[PDB]
Design a protein around this nucleic acid. Structure first.
Lengths: 150, 124, 104, 208, 138, 83
RNA sequence: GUAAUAGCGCCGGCCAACUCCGUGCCAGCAGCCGCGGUAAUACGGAGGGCGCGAGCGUUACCCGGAUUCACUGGGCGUAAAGGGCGUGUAGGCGGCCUGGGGCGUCCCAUGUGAAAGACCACGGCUCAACCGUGGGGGAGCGUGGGAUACGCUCAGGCUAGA
RNA sequence: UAGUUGGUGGGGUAAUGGCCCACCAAGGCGACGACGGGUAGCCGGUCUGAGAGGAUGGCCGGCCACAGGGGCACUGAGACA
């Protein structure tokens, strides 16, 4: 079913008298490598509860990637915050050519051949959201034809 | 900037500044020792860093670090400079190449010998 | 083909010679917009025919003098100082922007 | 000089069986038998969540140590398989399987890939008659890869070609165990190889 | 003054659609009508029609949208997700038939103005011609 | 004086000439006026000597003076055979 | 016909590779963040490991990462950034309709655009590196012919700007 | 800025030309950057880069310049050799 990759887990701190008080945040990707990917960011007082919370959160909020021979239907560029992500389709044998965060998603996404590029802010967390959005916006000659019927 | 502006003034290309006027933009420069002092570290660090004023053939008079457990440098010893600052010693921008000219290599160096210019010890 | 050009006579101050101001256009090699530069050619006018304001066709010729390799092939349209004006007015701003400054 | 050093230790580091010895790598001793943990003072300690790099790194090292090839040569094959049309991933594997020294191994002449390397090296091999001692030699489709006549009598060659009786051969190959010949029918496809490899990550590793 | 009539129209359209206007008027010009012709044919707008506002000529542009949606924000997906001016006064942009862009991997178009009339990138390529790159829609 | 001669283009021990039409004064490996053939001294392949006799005859038609060795190759491709 | 040169860098994070001992803000390391003041995976050795291999590592210099001069592809309320405001020259840009011109713009043909290199194909040296042969792509400019939507120009008209 | 920009006559050359000379005119250039200072041989290509672009032009080929530094002509189809 769903494979589960963990993008990043950070320690993040907070202040009270007497001192610092940490929380952990975990970004987790979940996919079947078939065309379903979900991203979830879960925070908790412990690394595990965090990953688990993220996993669960990712599982809810999945995106349907219109794969086509392991690659994508067209190039989209998406800005999210100061993070800009760029996806370009590739032929077979190209590989998933992207930085970690983007890749990890694209892999479980089921993609197997793409050209990528992170531009602007490279905050993993924002590049992640940026990627997911880019995937959501993908369309197919089908959808497009459908959209312009009337 | 408007396109017409770009056409008028246009972008100005950025210019990098060297961090090693070993002049001649050379890989190494040889100089003569002047003072084999011993400076003290900065901010936190503490110790007796071994340094040396050097009169380069490049016309420059500089301060250079002397890596290694123990050296043999004196007043007028010929040396080779390789460039590389030392975070703790403000004013030292080059290291001295051990194993070249008058700077002998480090004795009893059984590891990173490539640096500290020490020949391969013959295992008895 | 001996190169042929069209411009305006912005100067009739010389003997048997005139200053033709040939305009030119083209796409900027990197920013693509069509920019427009211009150059002045000294053309040979034997008959002292062509007058200030004339639009003429210049033709690549055999050197006549130093800095003068064009002959007035022919007249395209007479009188029209509206052009000479631009050229002169532009020369006028030069009359400053140095230690003083060009009017407006 | 291609590696040359303890090899069942690589089997161990990749935590996966590597047939870098042909025989034995069966007889309860490939070490991956009752000792599949990495070599060294730390092998038995718990492993930490590998980094994306670590994973891509380990994957390439595997695919590569399988053919006992140098990174140097390995890389060039890859950059070659990247330019040529077709899914880089498999195209790459095709070229890896077209090495004369590999083929020899594939055709049973040698027990291991190392052994085959030597047979090719020491001249004991042929390619359409003319002998070829270049392990990196690229075999094309439609080439006979026979054992050198002078060597057909070699103890080693007789044993291996013997046990080779019955043993089937890759669907992109074929061999005449009689005259100790064999042919490279076509470039193997990703499916033809049961490689414990995921070229996906190998391509990605050279992407970085 | 009205510096760029064509750009003014693409914007009026971009602006109206973002608030989901049914119609939307733009001062009429032969050229602008030529563009709208493609917009309709390519199915980006229900269509348009000449009209007189305050006595002066205008072109009603009948906007088109996707269907209503689910979850929060039921606002319809736009049919015109994009529409950007390219050639602009003081930065004209012309292309050879070999340089005619391939908008949105083919799912979008590009309106050129050729000596053979206003055509879409595909139309232009067919007729094998180039020219000022008016805009890009998708 | 315009000539028809050979131009070293091989590599060490792997010479490969180019029957060329150049000016007598150029480097032997310099810029020629036209290529009209090639020659593999060691006949390492079944095709070790092409000559495009059509063109040669043209050059000779106007003063091209062949090096001896160049002529000997041009003869082989029957540039002179007048049957 | 003999089992028969190996090395060099690294193992705190970036970055793949960890334990003991010695040392005690010392001796030293250091590209950045930093490490050493008695438990140091960061100093020195050792064992083990990772990388690469007649090599390995350093220094110097160029490009990439750097969309960090941004044409592709950035910005200016408070982060660096609106000129103190106006009047106006040059310049950049241009309401609606018609007609002429065809300068920009687009198309066709033709000429030129070297060889080498880059790309694809086949071939030669046991492979490859290297080299050979062939093919394809490629701006720009000259010349002839053509188109006229848009920009320009000329003539005329109108009024939605002024 | 004065052979400087053009003109007329002439010299010189294989040949056009202020290239050079006599006389005449008043000019010529500049902010679309003249003049001056600094640096440099320039170029198919090469390195990098997704590209645009950036950097580069030693080896090889094309052109230019120089020959211990400065100036000069002779002989020649051709050299300022």
């Amino acid at each position: 079913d769903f494979e589960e990759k963990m993008i990043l887990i950070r320690r993040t701190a907070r202040m009270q008298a007497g001192g610092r008080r940490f929380r952990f945040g975990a970004l987790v990707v979940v996919g079947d490598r078939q065309g379903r990917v979900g991203l979830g960011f879960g925070k908790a007082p412990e690394v595990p509860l965090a990953v688990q919370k993220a996993g669960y959160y990712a599982r809810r909020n999945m995106v349907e990637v219109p794969l086509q021979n392991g690659t994508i239907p067209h190039e989209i560029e998406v800005e999210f915050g100061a993070s800009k992500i760029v996806l370009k389709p590739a032929a077979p044998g190209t590989g998933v050519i992207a930085g970690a965060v983007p890749r990890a998603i694209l892999e479980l996404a089921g993609v197997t051949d793409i050209l990528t590029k992170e531009l602007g802010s490279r905050n993993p967390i924002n590049i992640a959201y940026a990627t997911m959005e880019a995937l959501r916006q993908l369309r197919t000659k089908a959808d497009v034809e459908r959209l312009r019927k009337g | 900037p408007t396109i017409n502006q770009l056409v008028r003034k246009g972008r100005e290309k950025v210019r990098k500044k060297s961090k090693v006027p070993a002049l001649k933009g050379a890989p190494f420069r040889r100089g003569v020792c002047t003072v084999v002092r011993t400076v003290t570290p900065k901010k936190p660090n503490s110790a007796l860093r071994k340094v040396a004023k050097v009169r380069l053939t490049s016309g420059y008079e500089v301060t250079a670090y002397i890596p290694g457990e123990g050296h043999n440098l004196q007043e007028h010893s010929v040396v080779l400079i390789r460039g590389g600052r030392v975070k703790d010693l403000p004013g030292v921008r080059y290291h001295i190449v051990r194993g070249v000219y008058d700077a002998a290599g480090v004795k009893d160096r059984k590891k990173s010998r490539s640096k500290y210019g020490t020949k391969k010890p013959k295992e008895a | 083909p001996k190169k042929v050009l069209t411009g305006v006579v912005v100067s009739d101050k010389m003997q048997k010679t005139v200053t033709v101001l040939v305009e030119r256009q083209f796409p900027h090699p990197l920013y693509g917009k069509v920019i427009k530069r211009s150059k002045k050619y000294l053309a040979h006018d034997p008959e002292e025919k062509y007058k200030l304001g004339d639009v003429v066709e210049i033709i690549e010729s055999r050197p006549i003098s130093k800095r003068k390799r064009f002959r007035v092939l022919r007249l395209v349209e007479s009188g029209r100082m509206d052009l000479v004006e631009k050229y002169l007015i532009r020369r006028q701003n030069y009359q400053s922007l140095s230690k003083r400054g060009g009017k407006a | 000089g291609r590696y040359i050093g303890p090899v069942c230790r690589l089997c161990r580091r990749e935590g996966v069986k590597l047939y870098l010895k042909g025989e034995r790598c069966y007889s309860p001793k490939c070490a991956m038998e009752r000792r599949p943990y990495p070599p060294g003072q730390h092998g038995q300690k718990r492993a930490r969540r590998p980094s994306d790099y670590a994973v891509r790194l380990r994957e390439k090292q595997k695919l590569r140590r399988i053919y006992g090839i140098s990174e140097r040569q390995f890389r060039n094959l890859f950059e070659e398989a990247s330019k040529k049309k077709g899914v880089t991933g498999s195209v790459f594997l095709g070229l890896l399987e077209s090495r004369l020294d590999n083929v020899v191994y594939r055709l049973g002449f040698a027990v291991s890939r190392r052994q085959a390397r030597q047979l090719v090296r020491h001249g004991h091999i042929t390619v359409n008659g003319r002998r070829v001692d270049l392990p990196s030699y690229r075999v094309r489709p439609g080439d006979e890869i026979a054992v050198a006549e002078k060597s057909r009598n070699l103890e080693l060659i007789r044993q291996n070609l013997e046990a080779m009786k019955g043993r089937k051969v890759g669907p992109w190959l074929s061999l005449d165990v009689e005259g100790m010949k064999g042919k490279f029918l076509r470039l193997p496809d990703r499916e033809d190889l049961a490689l414990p490899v995921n070229e996906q990550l190998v391509i990605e590793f050279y992407s970085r | 003054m009205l510096t760029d009539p064509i750009a003014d129209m693409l914007t009026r359209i971009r602006n109206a659609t973002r608030v989901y206007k049914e119609s939307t008027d733009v001062p009429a010009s032969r050229f602008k009508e030529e563009i709208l012709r493609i917009l309709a044919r390519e199915g980006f707008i229900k269509g348009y029609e000449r009209v007189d506002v305050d006595g002066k000529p205008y072109l009603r542009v009948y906007l088109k949208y996707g269907p209503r949606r689910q979850g929060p924000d039921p606002r319809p997906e736009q049919v015109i997700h994009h529409i950007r001016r390219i050639s602009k006064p003081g930065r004209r942009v012309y292309v050879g038939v070999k340089e005619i862009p391939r908008v949105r991997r083919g799912l979008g178009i590009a309106i050129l103005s050729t000596s053979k009339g206003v055509l879409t990138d595909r139309e232009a390529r067919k007729l094998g011609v180039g020219g000022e790159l008016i805009c890009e829609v998708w | 004086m315009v000539k028809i001669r050979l131009a070293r283009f091989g590599s060490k021990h792997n010479p490969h000439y180019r029957i060329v039409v150049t000016d007598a004064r150029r480097k032997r490996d310099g810029k020629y006026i036209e290529k009209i053939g090639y020659y593999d001294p060691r006949k390492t392949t079944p095709d070790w000597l092409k000559v495009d006799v059509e063109r040669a005859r043209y050059w000779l038609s106007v003063g091209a003076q062949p090096t001896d060795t160049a002529r000997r190759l041009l003869r082989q491709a029957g540039v002179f055979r007048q049957e």
